[PDB]
Structure 1
Amino acid sequence: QRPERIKTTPYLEGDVLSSDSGPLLSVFALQEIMQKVRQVQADYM
């Protein structure tokens, strides 16, 4: 229904690899941020 998503040439058509959304990416970012600091504090006195 959006004119931006209309494809008329197979140049922009390709396979699908993965998917993601907001509720997954937010918790992923929080996990990575906390994991980094926990690892750093564990590796050194």
Structure 2
Amino acid sequence: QRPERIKTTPYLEGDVLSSDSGPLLSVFALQEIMQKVRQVQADYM
């Protein structure tokens, strides 16, 4: 319905690799920050 997503040219079409949503990215960002800071703490005194 939105005109930006309608397509007529077979140059921008291919198989979908993966999907994503808000909560998964949010929890992943929190986990990666937490892992980074804990590795920082653990590798040293």
**TM-score, normalised by the number of residues in structure 2:** 0.95
**TM-score, normalised by the number of residues in structure 1:** 0.95
For CA contacts below 8 A with separation 6 or more, give which structure has more relative contact order: 1
Deviation for aligned residue 1:29:
0.3
Q: Output the aligned Cα RMSD.
A: 0.5
- Between the aligned residues of both structures, percent identity stands at 100
Deviation for aligned residue 1:8:
0.3
Partners in 1 of 2:23 and 2:44 — Cα distance?
33
Structure 1 residue runs of 4+, over 2 Å off? none
**CA-to-aligned-CA distance 1:1-45 (integer Å, 9 cap, x gap):** 110000101101111000001011000000000110000100001
Q: How many residues align?
A: 45
- Runs of at least 5 residues in structure 1 that lack an aligned partner in the other structure: none
